[PDB]
Design an enzyme around this catalytic site. Structure first.
Site, mmCIF file in Angstrom:
data_model
loop_
_atom_site.group_PDB
_atom_site.id
_atom_site.type_symbol
_atom_site.label_atom_id
_atom_site.label_comp_id
_atom_site.label_asym_id
_atom_site.label_seq_id
_atom_site.Cartn_x
_atom_site.Cartn_y
_atom_site.Cartn_z
ATOM 1 N N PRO A 35 2.241 48.116 7.173
ATOM 2 C CA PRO A 35 2.205 49.579 7.354
ATOM 3 C C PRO A 35 1.994 49.920 8.852
ATOM 4 C CG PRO A 35 0.122 48.768 6.488
ATOM 5 C CD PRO A 35 1.056 47.587 6.483
ATOM 6 N N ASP A 36 2.415 51.114 9.302
ATOM 7 C CA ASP A 36 2.017 51.663 10.591
ATOM 8 C C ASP A 36 0.703 52.424 10.511
ATOM 9 O OD1 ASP A 36 2.655 54.209 9.547
ATOM 10 O OD2 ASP A 36 4.483 54.465 10.764
ATOM 11 N N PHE A 37 0.382 53.195 11.528
ATOM 12 C CA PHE A 37 -0.823 54.056 11.475
ATOM 13 C C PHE A 37 -0.676 55.415 10.832
ATOM 14 C CE2 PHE A 37 -1.522 50.895 14.635
ATOM 15 C CZ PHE A 37 -2.802 50.448 14.351
ATOM 16 N N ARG A 38 0.358 56.129 11.251
ATOM 17 C CA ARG A 38 0.397 57.575 11.196
ATOM 18 C C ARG A 38 1.484 58.080 10.231
ATOM 19 N NH1 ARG A 38 -1.267 55.859 16.413
ATOM 20 N NH2 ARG A 38 -3.158 56.930 17.155
ATOM 21 N N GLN A 108 2.431 47.118 21.487
ATOM 22 C CA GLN A 108 1.129 47.610 21.018
ATOM 23 C C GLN A 108 0.646 46.891 19.770
ATOM 24 O OE1 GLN A 108 1.147 52.286 21.655
ATOM 25 N NE2 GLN A 108 3.212 51.545 21.220
ATOM 26 N N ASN A 109 1.536 46.138 19.118
ATOM 27 C CA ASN A 109 1.217 45.477 17.849
ATOM 28 C C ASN A 109 0.350 44.233 18.024
ATOM 29 O OD1 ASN A 109 2.863 47.406 16.817
ATOM 30 N ND2 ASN A 109 4.677 46.106 16.456
ATOM 31 N N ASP A 111 0.400 42.070 15.305
ATOM 32 C CA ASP A 111 0.936 41.185 14.234
ATOM 33 C C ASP A 111 1.529 39.891 14.804
ATOM 34 O OD1 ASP A 111 3.684 41.885 15.122
ATOM 35 O OD2 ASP A 111 3.529 43.715 13.901
ATOM 36 N N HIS A 128 -2.337 44.955 23.177
ATOM 37 C CA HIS A 128 -3.574 45.013 22.335
ATOM 38 C C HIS A 128 -4.096 43.661 21.899
ATOM 39 C CE1 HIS A 128 -2.437 49.451 21.613
ATOM 40 N NE2 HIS A 128 -3.322 49.333 22.584
ATOM 41 N N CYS A 139 -22.164 34.736 22.680
ATOM 42 C CA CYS A 139 -22.086 33.800 23.821
ATOM 43 C C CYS A 139 -20.781 33.717 24.644
ATOM 44 C CB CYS A 139 -22.445 32.421 23.369
ATOM 45 S SG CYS A 139 -21.218 31.698 22.272
ATOM 46 N N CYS A 160 -20.147 31.877 15.183
ATOM 47 C CA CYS A 160 -20.069 30.835 16.180
ATOM 48 C C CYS A 160 -20.768 29.543 15.671
ATOM 49 C CB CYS A 160 -20.737 31.368 17.417
ATOM 50 S SG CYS A 160 -20.711 30.285 18.853
ATOM 51 N N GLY A 199 9.938 52.409 17.555
ATOM 52 C CA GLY A 199 8.949 52.385 16.488
ATOM 53 C C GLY A 199 7.546 52.674 17.020
ATOM 54 N N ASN A 224 13.696 55.566 16.526
ATOM 55 C CA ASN A 224 12.407 55.892 15.885
ATOM 56 C C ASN A 224 12.720 56.956 14.854
ATOM 57 O OD1 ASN A 224 9.535 55.480 15.974
ATOM 58 N ND2 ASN A 224 9.246 57.633 16.586
ATOM 59 N N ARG A 225 11.859 57.115 13.868
ATOM 60 C CA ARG A 225 12.027 58.158 12.880
ATOM 61 C C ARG A 225 12.088 59.562 13.498
ATOM 62 N NH1 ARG A 225 7.999 56.628 8.757
ATOM 63 N NH2 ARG A 225 9.671 55.228 8.026
ATOM 64 N N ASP A 226 11.192 59.868 14.435
ATOM 65 C CA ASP A 226 11.077 61.179 15.078
ATOM 66 C C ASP A 226 11.157 61.088 16.551
ATOM 67 O OD1 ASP A 226 10.329 62.351 12.591
ATOM 68 O OD2 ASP A 226 8.447 61.239 12.856
HETATM 69 C C1 LIG Z 1 -6.237 50.765 17.480
HETATM 70 C C2 LIG Z 1 -5.411 50.893 18.769
HETATM 71 O O1 LIG Z 1 -5.968 50.933 19.874
HETATM 72 O O2 LIG Z 1 -4.041 50.895 18.638
HETATM 73 C C3 LIG Z 1 -3.309 51.324 17.486
HETATM 74 C C4 LIG Z 1 -1.782 51.210 17.807
HETATM 75 O O3 LIG Z 1 -1.404 49.979 18.540
HETATM 76 C C5 LIG Z 1 -1.585 52.516 18.606
HETATM 77 C C6 LIG Z 1 -0.142 52.930 18.735
HETATM 78 O O4 LIG Z 1 0.344 53.328 17.461
HETATM 79 P P1 LIG Z 1 1.931 52.986 17.219
HETATM 80 O O5 LIG Z 1 2.636 53.989 18.087
HETATM 81 O O6 LIG Z 1 2.136 51.537 17.428
HETATM 82 O O7 LIG Z 1 1.946 53.310 15.685
HETATM 83 P P2 LIG Z 1 2.071 54.771 14.934
HETATM 84 O O8 LIG Z 1 1.800 54.445 13.489
HETATM 85 O O9 LIG Z 1 1.174 55.788 15.691
HETATM 86 O O10 LIG Z 1 3.624 55.149 15.250
HETATM 87 C C7 LIG Z 1 4.654 54.496 14.428
HETATM 88 C C8 LIG Z 1 6.005 55.194 14.768
HETATM 89 O O11 LIG Z 1 7.059 54.501 14.086
HETATM 90 C C9 LIG Z 1 7.793 55.358 13.249
HETATM 91 N N1 LIG Z 1 8.271 54.497 12.199
HETATM 92 C C10 LIG Z 1 7.576 53.762 11.294
HETATM 93 N N2 LIG Z 1 8.432 53.138 10.555
HETATM 94 C C11 LIG Z 1 9.676 53.371 10.971
HETATM 95 C C12 LIG Z 1 10.894 52.940 10.567
HETATM 96 N N3 LIG Z 1 10.999 52.077 9.552
HETATM 97 N N4 LIG Z 1 12.036 53.354 11.195
HETATM 98 C C13 LIG Z 1 11.950 54.239 12.230
HETATM 99 N N5 LIG Z 1 10.700 54.655 12.646
HETATM 100 C C14 LIG Z 1 9.580 54.194 12.006
HETATM 101 C C15 LIG Z 1 6.697 56.391 12.825
HETATM 102 O O12 LIG Z 1 7.406 57.637 12.457
HETATM 103 C C16 LIG Z 1 5.940 56.578 14.144
HETATM 104 O O13 LIG Z 1 6.503 57.486 14.994
HETATM 105 O O14 LIG Z 1 -2.247 53.508 17.783
HETATM 106 C C17 LIG Z 1 -3.401 52.857 17.178
HETATM 107 O O15 LIG Z 1 -4.514 53.503 17.839
HETATM 108 N N1 LIG Z 2 1.901 46.036 13.334
HETATM 109 C C1 LIG Z 2 0.683 46.101 13.924
HETATM 110 O O1 LIG Z 2 0.363 45.179 14.678
HETATM 111 C C2 LIG Z 2 -0.106 47.333 13.793
HETATM 112 C C3 LIG Z 2 -0.500 47.611 12.285
HETATM 113 C C4 LIG Z 2 -1.644 46.567 11.919
HETATM 114 C C5 LIG Z 2 -2.922 46.901 12.839
HETATM 115 C C6 LIG Z 2 -2.583 47.124 14.227
HETATM 116 C C7 LIG Z 2 -1.296 47.328 14.677
HETATM 117 N N2 LIG Z 2 -1.393 47.494 16.044
HETATM 118 C C8 LIG Z 2 -2.694 47.409 16.432
HETATM 119 C C9 LIG Z 2 -3.293 47.551 17.660
HETATM 120 C C10 LIG Z 2 -4.660 47.411 17.844
HETATM 121 C C11 LIG Z 2 -5.396 47.150 16.699
HETATM 122 CL CL1 LIG Z 2 -7.234 46.914 16.792
HETATM 123 C C12 LIG Z 2 -4.757 47.037 15.455
HETATM 124 C C13 LIG Z 2 -3.420 47.190 15.322
HETATM 125 ZN ZN LIG Z 3 -21.569 31.950 20.057
#
Ligand SMILES: CC(=O)O[C@@H]1[C@H](O)[C@@H](COP(=O)(O)OP(=O)(O)OC[C@H]2O[C@@H](n3cnc4c(N)ncnc43)[C@H](O)[C@@H]2O)O[C@@H]1O
Ligand SMILES: NC(=O)[C@H]1CCCc2c1[nH]c1ccc(Cl)cc21
Ligand SMILES: [Zn+2]
Ligand SMILES: [Cl-]
Ligand code: NA
Length: 272
Positions: A35-38, A108-109, A111, A128, A139, A160, A199, A224-226
């Site tokens: 899954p993504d975040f948003r 940013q991933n 995975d 990340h 430690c 540890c 993405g 990207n979707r949007d």
């Molecule tokens: C925890 C941290 O510091 O970091 C994480 C993460 O690395 C950071 C950035 O979020 P990131 O931008 O990576 O994730 P988001 O979940 O914020 O953005 C995912 C983007 O991909 C689009 N999307 C998802 N699936 C798609 C698909 N199958 N085809 C086309 N578009 C698709 C979705 O609409 C969105 O715009 O927000 C979080 O805060």
């Molecule tokens: N596909 C992913 O790697 C995404 C979705 C799984 C959780 C995750 C992603 N990006 C991240 C950035 C920072 C931190 Cl702490 C977690 C994630």
């Molecule tokens: Zn330790």
């Protein structure tokens, strides 16, 4: 009055663009089953009700991790590398690398699927961090990434073997310093002759702003979707937005590049 997706393909074909900087986020891995975040309905931030959290962002925050590291490691059983495979999106970036076109891939991933797809570490900026290595939060002793996994898969909070303090994989939690390799953006972004953004919602800094660090004449292609971030708000004249599913959009570009059979061959060899 805009560049088309074909115009971008034809720049690449002509090697008029040959120093491509790519930026990716969680949207590129939804086709692999992560899954993504948003995203409404399926995003992490919409579906973390069950976890022990003050609010969903907390699971990826260093402070809350110290309080309770259990939700993070509960969730990371799944997210831990081994059980998802790269998709066409990742293999397209591999193909770009192999054809000598990729300056750098900023992800940013966590995975790790870029590395899985065969992108060399020197070409990658895991912005990340990574599960590939781990680190005692008491430690600072470094550990075999793999050894920590043994524990995580067997439902145990890694401690540890020396101080018994919690061992945390080398992931950048919220508010934490970016990794050392992130410094490469100062040599990279001015040198890029094409930017590809795939993405990502571009809601989090510093990625939102890197999209503006390329020189003003450089095309920016969003798949990207949007339409999002600086591309929605501060459009430039050579922006292209290919909106829709990311695999579809990549496959459209690959076809315009003339790479369709090469990509089929690649994917079958790697995963088929
Ligand atoms: C925890 C941290 O510091 O970091 C994480 C993460 O690395 C950071 C950035 O979020 P990131 O931008 O990576 O994730 P988001 O979940 O914020 O953005 C995912 C983007 O991909 C689009 N999307 C998802 N699936 C798609 C698909 N199958 N085809 C086309 N578009 C698709 C979705 O609409 C969105 O715009 O927000 C979080 O805060
Ligand atoms: N596909 C992913 O790697 C995404 C979705 C799984 C959780 C995750 C992603 N990006 C991240 C950035 C920072 C931190 Cl702490 C977690 C994630
Ligand atoms: Zn330790
Ligand atoms: Cl329930
Ligand atoms: Na609690």
């Amino acid at each position: 009055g805009k560049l088309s997706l074909q115009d971008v393909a034809e720049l690449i074909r002509a090697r008029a663009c040959q120093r491509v900087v790519v930026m990716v986020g969680a949207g590129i891995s939804t086709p692999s089953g992560i899954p993504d975040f948003r995203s409404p309905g399926s995003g992490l931030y919409s579906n973390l009700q069950q976890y022990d959290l003050p609010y969903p962002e907390a699971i990826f925050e260093l402070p809350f991790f110290f309080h309770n590291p259990k939700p993070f490691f509960t969730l990371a059983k799944e997210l831990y590398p081994g059980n998802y495979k790269p998709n066409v999106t990742h293999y397209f970036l591999r193909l770009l690398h192999d054809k000598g076109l990729l300056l750098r891939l900023y992800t940013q991933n966590i995975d790790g699927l870029e590395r899985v797809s065969g992108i060399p570490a020197s070409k990658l900026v895991e912005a990340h961090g990574t599960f590939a290595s781990a680190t005692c939060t008491v430690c600072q002793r470094p550990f075999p990434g793999e050894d920590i996994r043994a524990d995580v898969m067997a439902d145990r909070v890694p401690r540890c073997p020396v101080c018994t303090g919690v061992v945390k994989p080398d992931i950048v939690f919220f508010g934490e310093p970016l990794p050392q390799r992130f410094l490469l953006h100062v040599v990279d972004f001015p040198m890029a002759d094409l930017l590809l953004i795939l993405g990502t919602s571009l809601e989090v800094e510093p990625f939102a702003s890197l999209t503006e660090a390329v020189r003003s004449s450089v095309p920016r292609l969003l798949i990207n979707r949007d339409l999002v971030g600086p591309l929605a708000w501060h459009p430039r004249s050579r922006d292209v937005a290919q909106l829709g599913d990311v695999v579809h959009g990549v496959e459209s570009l690959v076809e315009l590049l003339g790479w369709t059979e090469e990509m089929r061959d690649l994917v079958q060899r790697e995963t088929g």
